[PDB]
Design a protein around this ligand. Structure first.
Ligand SMILES: [Mg+2]
Ligand SMILES: [Mg+2]
Ligand SMILES: [Mg+2]
Ligand SMILES: [Mg+2]
Ligand SMILES: [Mg+2]
Ligand SMILES: [Mg+2]
Ligand SMILES: [Mg+2]
Ligand SMILES: [Mg+2]
Ligand SMILES: [Mg+2]
Ligand SMILES: [Mg+2]
Ligand SMILES: [Mg+2]
Ligand SMILES: [Mg+2]
Ligand SMILES: [Mg+2]
Ligand SMILES: [Mg+2]
Ligand SMILES: [Mg+2]
Ligand SMILES: [Mg+2]
Ligand SMILES: [Mg+2]
Ligand SMILES: [Mg+2]
Ligand SMILES: [Mg+2]
Ligand SMILES: [Mg+2]
Ligand SMILES: [Mg+2]
Ligand SMILES: [Mg+2]
Ligand SMILES: [Mg+2]
Ligand SMILES: [Mg+2]
Ligand SMILES: [Mg+2]
Ligand SMILES: [Mg+2]
Ligand SMILES: [Mg+2]
Ligand SMILES: [Mg+2]
Ligand SMILES: [Mg+2]
Ligand SMILES: [Mg+2]
Ligand SMILES: [Mg+2]
Ligand SMILES: [Mg+2]
Ligand SMILES: [Mg+2]
Ligand SMILES: [Mg+2]
Lengths: 177, 51, 76, 136, 116, 67
RNA sequence: UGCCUGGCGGCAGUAGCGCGGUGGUCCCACCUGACCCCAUGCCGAACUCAGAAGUGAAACGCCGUAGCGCCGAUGGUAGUGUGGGGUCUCCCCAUGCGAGAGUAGGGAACUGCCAGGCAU
RNA sequence: CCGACUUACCAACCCGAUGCAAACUGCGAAUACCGGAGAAUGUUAUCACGGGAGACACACGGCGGGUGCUAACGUCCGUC
RNA sequence: CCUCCUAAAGAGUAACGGAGGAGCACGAAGGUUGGCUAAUCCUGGUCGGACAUCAGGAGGUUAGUGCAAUGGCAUAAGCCAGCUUGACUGCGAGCGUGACGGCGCGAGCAGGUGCGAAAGCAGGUCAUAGUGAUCCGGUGGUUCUGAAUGGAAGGGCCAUC
């Protein structure tokens, strides 16, 4: 809750002033975080996909869903229904917790940093972001690794405009370039 | 074409049987549905036998 | 040379028109799908045949938010 | 020649050609060549009339063709009997009813237009006349 | 959207009940309150009605939106109907999935009498 | 949250270089010794430069010292 | 009797959408918890329960406005039943029926039962 | 490694305008057909059952069409 | 044998007329209860590319339907789950379609089932193709018949090849 707490007094009240939100309800809050990691190399061997699953379960604290192709595509030689990736939605206590971790452990282990981008926003205000390796999280143990592997990390928000979001992020001292 | 014919036989020893079809390649499992035997006038087990 | 085929006609359509006096059972329409929908005292068969469920008179009407056509038996 | 790039079907019933036309106004250009009679216009007749009226303005102004031949016409080979299926497609036509503006011109003087359209009309199987825009 | 997703979820049963021409005991529940009414077969005429907004029922209750407010409404209506003239009835979830508060309302009405 | 399908998720302690210590919930299942927290980091702190370009003329006058 | 609001209908775009305002006493919504009843192919998001610190931001209801949708004459034209006729692949005359499109224009729905709150 | 200047030329979606369709339809007749009610008229003209058949090569003309060349005293259907 | 058109707005309607399909498949792809909503483009995002999986927006069925075409389909007949065998036996008011043989639809009765708290629903599948008379034989059943009589053989009847 650290940052849920921080959010509930420090963040809300700053943003409160700098936009002149009359209603408090108007203040952007963070809704949910979701961690995709597609694993096309599944159609080759299915063990790989489950091996991802444990990673994403080890990072995040909860079992991932296993996603399947919506339609068949011949481009990648897949057919509708084969498992090809896995996600976790994070919503509460756990969502704020992982977030805390992301900022204050994971992201300053990025092999050579320059912050993150502040360009990656959808236009409504939901921050999307990749990670090249998965050693970034100390949840995993680097000498017990099969492969280098990545994920998306998408922070879905109640922000209305692209801009208004950025503020919400920054106000948690989010490391933008 | 491929679906064979089979008879399902009452467990109530009456003799009475139904008939149906089956893909044996794909599902080779002696089919055991439960049907109404009218010689004893009660639902009982029926078990796949050969036509 | 590659043509020359056709199927046998199915005599579909309305058998009993608006105002006609019918007996319970009588077929009203034969159709493919529910071009007409069963209304009051009217059943719908497994080939979407509409039939009277009670002696009376046939009645068509348009009703509902989709402007569908319904058939009903007034029990006159 | 003008001809549908593709069609749902190869061959069409004969049909009839009753009625008056839709498209009786000069809509694009200033002058048009309207059809008084009734008949078929073949792709070839359209191309021949088009070339005639182009050449006699020396590529000044702009020509619209309002009609388009989208009806295929079949014929039986020589020395074959009746029956054994429908014939093979040979050429394409447009059905013309009285009133159908056929071509439109713009960007030349009226008296030049007159002489351009008079030539093209000699290439057509249907009686035509010259027409102008109307305010309404 | 919740209400749209709910209304849709109710409509099949709502329509079945029309054709059968049944007096229907129809529920409605929100965070704070639960309601009941019994509608004439035509679907346009209330006969008896009971809820946690009528002061007479509420003044007992510790809270107007729980499984005990339910039982209170699930009795008032059944009394007010059995004393009217209405024994046989059909229950109408109305989207809400027969459980908890909604089911509590219903069970109590089976105790009073209402024969569904 | 469903029962007995998810991994253990518990308190630990995460001691950086700069003495910085933070109780945190994680699977890892024992206390970490990490080396660069959000306080120990050039970028977060404000350190990293951007590589000094445009030295050629400074270089040359530093290197030779000639009239 | 008036004004609000919730539930169930009739009716099924003259009733829908957009654009602009506006409402929290009650109602409704978001909302606050989650060991429990119940729940998630992961997630109290949804469903479910126990509640009332907060806000009407969204949503929802209400009010206004013609940018759209929608409705739409009168007249004329097209067609066509019967009887005549021609220059008969297509038309014309007498009589009966008479569109579609488009034009003027309409239009920001109308209405029943029950309950609740306020005002008189 | 991107670029940058320039388009003598091609043009998707979208927007506005103009057409066409037996196998297109956000429209839609006249007639025809089904059912009900009422007069007048008609040597029951109607339906059922029983005795006896013949016929199952059709032709042209009008109207609506397929085929053919809107050829045929052609050919194939509907209707008088 | 099925679907569309020709076919002239009820049915039906020919040609060596114009176009396409069938000679199956499913113990779930059937029954019921509970729940759910498509295509496609745009924006952002590790490998990841025009196209895989994630998040948001626009969109509103332009998707989907075991297999043709047509008519249907949101209360979905489309998609996912739990439990299950109504892919029941006897019958059937009434009606549709045929020259006939036949084929089709069916509410309700009786017995015994499944799902649902219940109201209810279920006699296969969104519907329309997936088919072969009679004879002569086979298999199982049978309060029938049994050439002097008791049996039996053969015959009938019901189920099926
Ligand atoms: Mg047919
Ligand atoms: Mg049925
Ligand atoms: Mg015609
Ligand atoms: Mg025309
Ligand atoms: Mg909630
Ligand atoms: Mg109009
Ligand atoms: Mg008029
Ligand atoms: Mg009009
Ligand atoms: Mg409005
Ligand atoms: Mg009559
Ligand atoms: Mg009469
Ligand atoms: Mg003969
Ligand atoms: Mg003959
Ligand atoms: Mg002949
Ligand atoms: Mg003849
Ligand atoms: Mg003729
Ligand atoms: Mg002669
Ligand atoms: Mg002849
Ligand atoms: Mg017809
Ligand atoms: Mg006709
Ligand atoms: Mg004939
Ligand atoms: Mg034929
Ligand atoms: Mg199915
Ligand atoms: Mg269902
Ligand atoms: Mg992509
Ligand atoms: Mg989306
Ligand atoms: Mg489609
Ligand atoms: Mg189904
Ligand atoms: Mg009978
Ligand atoms: Mg039970
Ligand atoms: Mg089917
Ligand atoms: Mg023999
Ligand atoms: Mg004997
Ligand atoms: Mg003997």
């Amino acid at each position: 809750a650290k940052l849920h707490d921080y959010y509930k007094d420090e963040v809300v009240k700053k943003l409160m002033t700098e936009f002149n939100y009359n209603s408090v309800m108007q203040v952007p809050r963070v809704e949910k975080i979701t961690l995709n990691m597609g694993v096309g190399e599944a159609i080759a061997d299915k063990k790989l996909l489950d091996n991802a699953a444990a990673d994403l379960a080890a990072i995040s604290g909860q079992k991932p869903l296993i996603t399947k192709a919506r339609k068949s595509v011949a481009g990648f030689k897949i057919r509708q229904g084969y498992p090809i990736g896995c996600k976790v939605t994070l919503r509460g206590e756990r969502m704020w917790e992982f977030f805390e971790r992301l900022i204050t452990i994971a992201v300053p282990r990025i092999r050579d940093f320059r912050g993150l981008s502040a360009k990656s926003f959808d236009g409504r205000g939901n921050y999307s972001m990749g990670v090249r390796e998965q050693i970034i999280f100390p949840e995993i143990d680097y000498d017990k690794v099969d492969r280098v592997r990545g994920l998306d990390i998408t922070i879905t928000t109640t922000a209305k405009s692209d801009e208004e979001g950025r503020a919400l992020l920054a106000a948690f001292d989010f490391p933008f370039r | 074409g491929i679906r064979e014919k089979i008879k399902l036989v009452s467990s109530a020893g009456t003799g009475h049987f139904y008939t149906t079809t089956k893909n044996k390649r794909t599902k080779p499992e002696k089919l055991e549905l439960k049907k109404f035997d009218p010689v004893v006038r009660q639902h009982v087990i029926y078990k796949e036998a050969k036509i | 040379t590659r043509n020359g085929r056709d199927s046998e006609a199915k005599r579909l359509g309305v058998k009993r028109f608006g105002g006609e006096s019918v007996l319970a059972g009588s077929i009203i329409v034969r159709q493919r799908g529910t071009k007409f929908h069963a209304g009051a005292n009217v059943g719908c068969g497994r080939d979407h045949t509409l039939f009277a469920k009670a002696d009376g008179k046939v009645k068509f009407e348009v009703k509902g938010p989709k402007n569908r056509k319904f058939i009903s038996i007034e029990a006159e | 020649m003008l001809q549908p790039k593709r069609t749902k079907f190869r061959k069409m019933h004969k049909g009839r050609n009753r009625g008056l036309a839709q498209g009786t106004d000069v809509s694009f250009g200033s002058f048009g060549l309207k059809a008084v009679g009734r008949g078929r216009l073949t792709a070839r007749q359209i191309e021949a009339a088009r070339r005639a009226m182009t050449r006699a303005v020396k590529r000044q102004g702009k020509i619209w063709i309002r009609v388009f031949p989208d009806k295929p016409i079949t014929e039986k080979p020589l020395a074959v009997r009746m029956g054994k299926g429908k014939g093979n497609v040979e050429y394409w036509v447009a059905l013309i009813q009285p009133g159908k503006v056929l071509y439109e011109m713009d960007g030349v003087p009226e008296e030049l237009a007159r002489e351009a359209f008079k030539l093209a009309a000699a290439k057509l199987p249907i009686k035509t006349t010259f027409v102008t825009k109307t305010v309404m | 959207d919740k209400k749209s997703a709910r209304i849709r979820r109710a409509t099949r049963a709502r329509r079945k009940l029309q054709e059968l021409g049944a007096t229907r005991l129809v529920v409605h529940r929100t965070p704070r309150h639960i309601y009941a009414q019994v509608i004439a077969p035509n679907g346009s005429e209330v006969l008896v009605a009971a809820s946690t907004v009528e002061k007479a029922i509420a003044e007992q209750l510790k809270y107007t939106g729980n499984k005990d407010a339910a039982a209170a409404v699930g009795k008032a209506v059944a009394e007010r109907a059995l004393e009217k003239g209405i024994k046989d009835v059909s229950f109408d979830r109305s989207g809400f999935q027969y459980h908890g508060r909604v089911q509590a309302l219903a069970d109590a009405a089976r105790e009073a009498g209402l024969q569904f | 949250m469903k029962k007995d399908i998810h991994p253990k998720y518990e308190e630990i302690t995460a001691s950086c270089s700069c003495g910085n210590v933070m109780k945190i919930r994680s699977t890892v299942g024992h206390d970490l010794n990490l080396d660069v927290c959000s306080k120990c980091h050039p970028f977060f702190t404000g350190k990293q430069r951007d590589v000094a370009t445009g030295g050629r003329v400074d270089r040359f006058n530093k290197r030779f010292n000639i009239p």
